[PDB]
Symmetry: D2
Subunit: 401 residues, 4 copies
Amino acid sequence: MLDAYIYAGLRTPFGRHAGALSTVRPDDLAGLLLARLAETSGFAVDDLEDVILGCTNQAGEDSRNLARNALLAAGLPARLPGQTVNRLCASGLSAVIDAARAISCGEGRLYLAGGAESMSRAPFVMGKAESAFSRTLEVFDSTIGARFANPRLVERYGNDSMPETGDNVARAFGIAREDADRFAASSQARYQAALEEGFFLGEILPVEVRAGRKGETRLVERDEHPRPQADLAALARLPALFAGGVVTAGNASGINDGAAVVLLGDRAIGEREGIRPLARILASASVGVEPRLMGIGPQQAILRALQRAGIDLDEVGLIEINEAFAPQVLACLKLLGLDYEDPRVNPHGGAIALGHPLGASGARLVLTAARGLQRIERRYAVVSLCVGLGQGVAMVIERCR
Amino acid sequence: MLDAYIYAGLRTPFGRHAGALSTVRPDDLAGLLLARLAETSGFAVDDLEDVILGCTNQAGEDSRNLARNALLAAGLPARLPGQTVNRLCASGLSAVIDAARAISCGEGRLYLAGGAESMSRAPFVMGKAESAFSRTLEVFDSTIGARFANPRLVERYGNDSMPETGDNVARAFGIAREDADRFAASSQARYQAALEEGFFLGEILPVEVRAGRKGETRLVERDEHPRPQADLAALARLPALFAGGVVTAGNASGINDGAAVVLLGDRAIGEREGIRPLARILASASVGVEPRLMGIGPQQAILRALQRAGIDLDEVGLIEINEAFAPQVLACLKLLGLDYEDPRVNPHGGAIALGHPLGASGARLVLTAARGLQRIERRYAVVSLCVGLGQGVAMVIERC
Amino acid sequence: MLDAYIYAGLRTPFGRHAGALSTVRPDDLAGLLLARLAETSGFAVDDLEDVILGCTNQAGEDSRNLARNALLAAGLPARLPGQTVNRLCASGLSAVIDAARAISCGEGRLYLAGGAESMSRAPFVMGKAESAFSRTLEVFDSTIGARFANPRLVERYGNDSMPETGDNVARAFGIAREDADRFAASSQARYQAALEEGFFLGEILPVEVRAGRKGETRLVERDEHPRPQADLAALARLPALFAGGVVTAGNASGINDGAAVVLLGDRAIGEREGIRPLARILASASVGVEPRLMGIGPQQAILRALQRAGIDLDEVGLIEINEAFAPQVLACLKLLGLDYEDPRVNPHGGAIALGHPLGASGARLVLTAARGLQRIERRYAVVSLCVGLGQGVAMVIERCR
Amino acid sequence: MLDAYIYAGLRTPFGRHAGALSTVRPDDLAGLLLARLAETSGFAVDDLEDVILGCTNQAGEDSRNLARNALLAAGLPARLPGQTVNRLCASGLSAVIDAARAISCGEGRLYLAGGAESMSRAPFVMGKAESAFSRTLEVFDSTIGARFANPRLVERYGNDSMPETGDNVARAFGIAREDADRFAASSQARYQAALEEGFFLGEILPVEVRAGRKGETRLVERDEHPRPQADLAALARLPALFAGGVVTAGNASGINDGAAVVLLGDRAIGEREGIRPLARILASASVGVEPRLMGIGPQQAILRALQRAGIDLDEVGLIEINEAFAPQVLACLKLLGLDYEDPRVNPHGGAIALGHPLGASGARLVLTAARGLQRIERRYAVVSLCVGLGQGVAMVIERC
C-alpha cells in the first residue's frame, strides 16, 4: 500500500488555445501555484523535498526542466530541487505517483507534484541537417500530434491521430455517436451545475494577465473551455472529424493552457504540524495497450490499481476518467460494466467542458477527486487517463476525515 | 532503505557531436539496449512493469515520451508502459532512482531504467507568434544552453553558462588550473588503462551505423570522445574559454550521443529465476544549490545519501562523480575532505574522456559503478552528478 | 533622349505594417492594378509586350518572378511575359526605366511597369547547414534590414542600419533635428491638403480585404500611414532612434504594403489609338555612393539625369525625392542649392506621410509626378530615390498636353 | 536594331548540388568574375555604368540586390551601381538584354551583365503568422520548386513541376524517349569533345575553395556536373521520374552552383581603347506561353528575335537552346523545322552535361555563343531559354 497524503492543491483556470492564458509562460503558470501553496499550506518551505511536474512538450519556455525553472521563477528557495516527468496525457498523474512512491519509501516528508502545459506557446521544431546543404526540412508544430515519427514504430502500429483512435474504440466496442453526444452534453451540464454550486471556489487560483492596451491587467477567474450552450441537440448537428467517424469537435476535448499542483507528505509531518490531509494515496497502476485503441488504457489500469488498493469498484464513490474523447470514456465504462451515465463519473464535469492541457489534466483529476471525496458517503476515488501511443494510468485515493 | 536490485545493464559507445552515432535516432539508440536486455537478461519480458528513461531535450526524435517510442520501435510488447524523466544532467540517475522507489513500494517486480541523448540530432526550436505578422522570432539550438530563458530567473540568479559555473566554483573553493588539468589527464589515462584491461567489454553494446556508401555498414564498438594524447603538458597549453577562468575545452566534458539502461527488480524475482543481482540500491538524495555554483551539487547529495544508506564515506570503495568540468569535481572532493587524487574516484575514467550525452550519463555511472564494485574489496559505491540550474543527485549501492 | 510615354497608372493605398493590406498577397495586390489597367487603358491587351515589377524581397508570395505570377493570377493572357527587378528602394523606378529603355530601342510598343512590396507578409529566412548536424542557425526577418551580410563587405563599409545612415548624412552635411522635424510636419500637412483637394482620386485603386468575421469584406480607399496630428510640436518631443542622433520614428518613413503600376508605350501606338499620354520619359541616371551616406544618392543621380535630359533644375516644376529620412531629403536639397521648404518638393506629401513599401515607392513617384505635372506651368518633373548600400536613381519626365 | 557589343566574359565552373562550389557565397562567386573582368578587360573601371545580375532566388546571401553586394564585396568602386533581375531560367540572358538596351539608348558606354546562383546555399523560407499563436507554418526550400503558390494561379494553370512540363511537351509534340536520350548522349559527348579540344580554357575562371583541413585550399577548374559515362545504352536503362513520362534524371539538367558575366559596351569605347569586340547584340524577344508547356517558349522567342535581327534561321551558324529537359529542346527543334541532330545546336554541350544554376545559365549561353562564333563561318548565333510559368527569351548576336 502506498502511504502518501494529499494535504492541499490548487490549479489555474484552463484557457482555450490563444485564449485567456496564452500570454503566460508555462513556467510562470506553474510558478504561481508553487508560490501560493508554499505561502499558504502551513508547512515549512524547508521541509519541501522536491517539485515534480508533468509536461508533455519541454521544447519551449517549459524546456530544460520546467519544475526547477518554475520553482526558481516563483521565488522558492534555490535549496529545493525539481524534476519534470513525461508520460504524455498521464504526465500530471505520473508526477503525483512518483512523489507518492518517494514519500512511501521514506525519501522526503513533503513534495509539490502536478503538471503544466502551454499548448498556445508550444514552439515550432526543425530537424538538424543530416548532410551539408541538405534540402529535407522536417518542421513540426509541438502544440499537438506526431512529430519526427519513427518509421519502425509506424510500420508495426500505424499513424492514427488521437481523434482517429476514438473512432477505432467506438468501432471496436460498439459506442454510438448518440451515446457519445449524450455523454458530451452531460459533461457541459455537470460543469455548469458544479460552477453554480461554488464547487470550484477553493480549487482555482485566478491569474492576472496583460489585458493589452498598456498597464492594463485582467483577472482570469474562470475556466474558458466550457460551452454550456452545447446541449444534445447542438452536438447531434456537428460533422464527424473523419468520414464514417463518431468523434466531433463537440464530443472531444480541446487544446488548452493550464497548471495544477498538489502538496503530498507522509502522515507524520501533518501530525507534527497539526495539519489534516484531504486524502491518502493507496495505489497506482500503469499499463500499455495497442496504440490504435489507446483510449481503453484506463480499464486495465483501474482494475490493477483497485486490486493493489484491496478494494472493489462498488466501494468507489467517485471516478475521474479523463474525457479525451466521449467514445473512449464510454468504452472504458462499458468494459468496467458501468452505465454510461453512472453518477460517480466526472460528477463536476470533465475535459470536454474544462479542456485538456495535456501535462496538467492528470494533476487536476487528483485535486478535484480529493476535494470531491469530501462531499460523499463512500471513502474511495479512482483517477485515470488514457495516454497517446497506448497507455493507461490509474490511482486509488481514500478520504481521511 | 531502498530495496531494489541491479541485475544487468548495457550502454552504447558514447559518440562525438556529428560523430560515430550522429545517424542513430535517440529512440533507436535506447531501443537497441531495451531489446538486447529484454532478450538476454534471463527474465520473462512479461514481468517488466515499466521503462523509465532520462532525456534532457524531448523536442525532437526523443519527443512525445522517448521511453514508450523507444520500447515500441525496438519490438518490446505494446502491453509495456514507459515514461521519460528530465532532471537535466542527473536525468539517467533520476530514472533509476524512480524505478528503485517504485520497486521498493511493491509496484512491479522488474523495471528498465536509464537515459539517452542525441545532442547531434537535437532540433532547432522556434517561438510561436505573439501577434499577427510578428517580426520577433526566437530561434534556439536544443543541443545545449539556455533557450527561451525566463526574465525573472535571469534577474535573481544571472545567465552564467555551465563552463562559467565551473570558473565560479574554482574561484569560490580555490581550485588551481594545474590541479584541474592533472584531474583531466588522470581521467584520460584511467580510461585508456581500463580500455586495455578489457573493463568495457561487457558494458558496451556495439552499434551498427550506415557508412553512407549505398548499403555499407560500420560497427561502432569504442567510445569516440577519449583523447589518449591529452597529457598534463598538452592540457596546460590550451586557453581558458573565458578570461580569469580555469575551464578549457580539455578539462571539460564534451557534447555527445549515447544511451545507457539498467535492469532493476526486487530480490524475489532473481531468487525465483536463479539470477544473482550485481548490487542493491540502498538510498538516494536530490538537493538544490545556487545555480551560479551548480557544480558543488554533489557534496550535500552525497552526504544525505550516505546518511540515508547509514554508511561513512570511509566504507565507500568506488566514487562516480560526473566530470562536467574538472574544477567542479575537485571542489566536490575538497568539500568532502578527499585528496584530489583519491583512487576510488572515476577509477576507469570519466566524462572528460568518455563525454556527456546529458540524459545517458547518470545511467552510465550506475552501470559502471555496479560493474566496478565486482572487482574491489569495499562493498559500497556512491554515484553523483551536478545539475544545471543548481542541483545534486546521489545514489548509494552495495555489492550483492 | 529616351522616347517612352506614360499613358496611365494606378496604385493601391499604402497600408501600415500588419495593417489594412496585411491579408493581401503581394502578387494579388500587383495583379489588381495590372487587371484594372489592362481593362480600362483603351489599348489592346495583345499589344502589351511585357510586365516589369520592382520587388526588394522575392523570398515569399513575391518569389519565383512576382511580375509573371501577378499577371497570371490577375487573369492577363499567358502570352504576356514578365520580369521582376531589384535595386532595393529604387526598384519601382528602375522597372519603369527598364521598360522606357526597351520602348526607346523599338523592342515592344507598350509595357506595364511598377513595383509591389508586402512588408507584412515578408517571410523568415533560414540558412542551409554548411555541415551535417551543424549547430549554427542564421535566421532573419526578410521584412527589412541586413540578412546574411558579407563579412568582406562589412569590413570595407561597416554595418550601419538605414536610420543610422540618416544620422550620418545629418552629421556630414549639417542638418539640424529642428529642420528635419519641420520637413516631416510639412510632409504630413501637404498630404492632408492634397487629400482634401481630391488630388489622390484618380491615382488610388481601392482594395477589397477580408474584414474578419466570416463573409465580411471592407474597402481600403485611403492611405493608412499618414499622421495629420504630427505637427512640429509633437515631432520635437520624440526620442532619437540612436544616441546623439537626429532620426526619429516621426521624421523617418515606415514599413508598409502597397503596389504601383504605370502603362508606358511609344508615341506611335497612342497616335494610332487616339489616346494621349500624360508625359514623356526623357532620361534616367543611376549612381553609387558610400553605403554609410546612401541618402545623398539622389543629388548626383538628379544632376546626371537633368544633364542627359538637356534641362536645368530651374526649368523643373515638380521634384519627387523619396522621403526615407527627413535628414537625407534635406541633405539632397542642400547639395542641390535648394531651400528646405522649396514648394516643388513632394508637393502632395511624401513617404513620411504615405509610408515606404520599398518596391512600390519609386513607381508611386513616377505616377504622382506625371499626374502632378498636369496642374503646373513648368513642363518638367524629376523623380529620385536614395538606395540601401549607397545608390541614387533619378528620372526626368516632360508633360505632353 | 540593338547596338551593344560583347567585349569579354568569364564564368565559374558550374558545381553539383552540395558540390565543388557549395562553400562559395553567390555574391562572392559573382564578385570573383566582376573583379577579374574589371582588372583584365583593358577598359577603365571608371567607365563602367552599372552591374546587372540575374538571380532567381534572392532570399539568402543573394538577397538585398546581389549585383551591388557582389561588386562591393569584390572591391569594385562604391561609385558603381547595380541591380538584380529575375525572369527565372532566362534571368542571366535578361540581364544582358537590359544592359544591351541601356547601351543602345546612350545610357552608359560599358556594363557588366550576367547571372549567379547558389542552389546549394539557397535558404529555407517560412511564412509570417497570420494570427497570434498560429499553428499554421508554411516552410519551403528556396533551392527550387513552387513555394507559397497562389491558389488563383493553381486553379487556372495547374501545379505541374518543371519535369512534368517536359513530359507534357513530349506528349503534345510527339517526342520519343529514344530521341530524348540520344540528345542527352550527344550533349555529354559534345561537352567531352570540346573539353579535350581546349574550348573552355579562356571561358572558365578557376575558383579556389576550402578543402576543410584547417587551411587547405583546392582549385576548381572543371565543370563538375558532366557524366562522360552516360552513353545512349546507360540512359535507356534509367526510369522516367513520372509514369507515362519520357523525362529521367539523365535527359534533364540538374541543380547547380555557378556564375557567368559578360562585359558589354558601345562601339566607340572599344575604338577609343583599341579593343575589338567578340560580337554585336542585334535583337531580343520575350514571349509568354501556357505554363503547362513552358518548354516550347524558345520557338516564338527565336522567331521574333530573328525577325527583329532581320535574318533567316538559315544564316545562323550556332544555336544555344538551354537543355532544361532533352524533350523540350527536341520539341523546339521540331517546331522550328530543324533535325534533332542539327550540329549548330549546343555544339560544345548543354545543361544536361554542364548543369543549370538557374540565374547563371542564360549568361553562360551568351558567353559561349560569342566564343563559339569565333570558330565558325556563318556569323549569326541565337541564344534562347524556356522559363518556368511559361516564357521564352531569345537574343541574336553577330560576330564582329
